[PDB]
Amino acid sequence: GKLRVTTTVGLGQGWLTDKVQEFLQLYPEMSIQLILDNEELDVNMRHADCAIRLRQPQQSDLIQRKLFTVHMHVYAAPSYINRHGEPQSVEDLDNHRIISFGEPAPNYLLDVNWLENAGRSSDNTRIPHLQINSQTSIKRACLLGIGIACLPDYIVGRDPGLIQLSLAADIPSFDTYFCYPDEMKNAAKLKAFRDFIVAKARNWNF
Amino acid sequence: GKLRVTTTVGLGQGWLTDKVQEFLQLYPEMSIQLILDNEELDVNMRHADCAIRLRQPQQSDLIQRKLFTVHMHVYAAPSYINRHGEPQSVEDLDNHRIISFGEPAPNYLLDVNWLENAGRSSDNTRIPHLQINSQTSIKRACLLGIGIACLPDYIVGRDPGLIQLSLAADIPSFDTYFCYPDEMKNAAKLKAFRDFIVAKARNWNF
């Protein structure tokens, strides 16, 4: 039968789709609905059967497990570096083209505009060359050599084709969580998907 | 300066990001914000400066130009066909794994669940093996050989790596439109982007 899984658009497009292929090869009598939303769909309102969240769920009636820690890094394409050079510091970004998410951003999507704010006051941010409210499109724009991007590891992947820039600055990491309502704890379809996702998350050494 | 452009998530990710790279190479003193939303953001409320719509705008105060006609086709990966065979008809889909968008779908996103409904009554739809409310993730799932997908040409592209399936059924085509408020008609930044997008749309023979 059908399991409904909700997560953010970025995590759904960048990581979860490929994991669902691996899952459906193991459980061919299951079907999955991925509901990708940057608004946190209420799992208890039965919009989904489970969720992957980019922050710790605060609802006391959700069973939760930590999955993996996400790191944010700064990237550029070879085709950008070959034309514009490599920035050595956060201050060198003032001479570079930056790509960011823009506003509005979801309140739990941390540091998606980090390149605009890094080393600057909130009233004197960097002017981005491109903004796109889609992490996969920011990766695409970065690969096309439009500019420098700040991206999570689950978007970039193990073989990015991107140079990681060492700007002598740390971007905060955050934890991902699998969560589901107590009503679903005994459903075989949810146990199968939970235990698969927890196993895949532990093996996700980026 | 900054131009804000809104469109659907699918068109933004599948086509417009690559066109914005070409645009920003021509107009390096401009910046772009892409605002990707499947809800039709109101351009007259100044949420954006212009839009690309998948239906004809009904607002009488919007200047509009038809861009291109979009065709929907059915696709499978070589890795799917090599394992499951090729369906020869719409009825053969009953023995196949289908990938669809799911519900809720936006009211202007026509036929994103066509594979569920094709040759069936509304009360006896096909059970999809996978649903994802993201056209780019449906393409990815199709390329991974999860199942058969119905996709627009602007998602698939000229070199899809996908087999187009001839199911002896026509899926309705729809037109795309560029639109902007009359207030913006004289802005140099909007003229540049409009005339570029209109030229790119005419050259988009899929």
Author numbering:
A (entry chain B), B (entry chain A): 95 to 300
Q: Which text from the study accompanies this structure?
A:
To experimentally support the biocomputational structure model, we employed cryo-EM of purified LsrB. Instead of the expected tetramers, we captured LsrB dimers, likely due to unstable homotetrameric oligomerization in the absence of DNA. We excluded the DNA-binding domain from our analysis due to its high flexibility, prior to refining the volume density map (resolution 3.9 Å) and fitting it with the AlphaFold 3-generated model. The results show that AlphaFold accurately predicted both (i) the dimeric interface of the two LsrB monomers and (ii) the spatial arrangement of the chains. Based on the validated 3D structure, we were able to localize the two pairs of cysteine residues (C144/C273 and C236/C244). We calculated the distances between the cysteine residues in each pair and found them to be below 10 Å. The cryo-EM structure, combined with structural modeling, provides compelling evidence for the formation of intramolecular disulfide bonds involving both conserved (C144–C273) and nonconserved (C236–C244) cysteine residues. Additionally, the predicted spatial separation of over 50 Å between cysteine residues from different monomers strongly argues against the possibility of intermolecular disulfide bond formation. In contrast, substitution of C273 led to increased H2O2 sensitivity reminiscent of the lsrB-deletion mutant phenotype. When LsrB was reduced with TCEP, which breaks the S-S bond and converts the cysteine residues back to their reduced form (-SH), and subsequently subjected to modification of cysteines with MMTS, which “traps” free thiol groups by forming mixed disulfides, peptides containing all four cysteine residues (C144, C236, C244, C273) were identified with MMTS modification.
Unlike many bacteria, Agrobacterium harbors another redox-associated LTTR, called LsrB (LysR-type symbiosis regulator B). LsrB is solely found in Rhizobiales, such as the plant symbiont Sinorhizobium meliloti or the intracellular mammalian pathogen Brucella abortus (there designated as VtlR = virulence-associated transcriptional LysR-family regulator). LsrB is a major regulator of various cellular responses, including the coordinated regulation of small RNAs, ABC transporter or β-lactam resistance genes. Agrobacterium tumefaciens LsrB possesses four cysteine residues potentially involved in redox sensing.
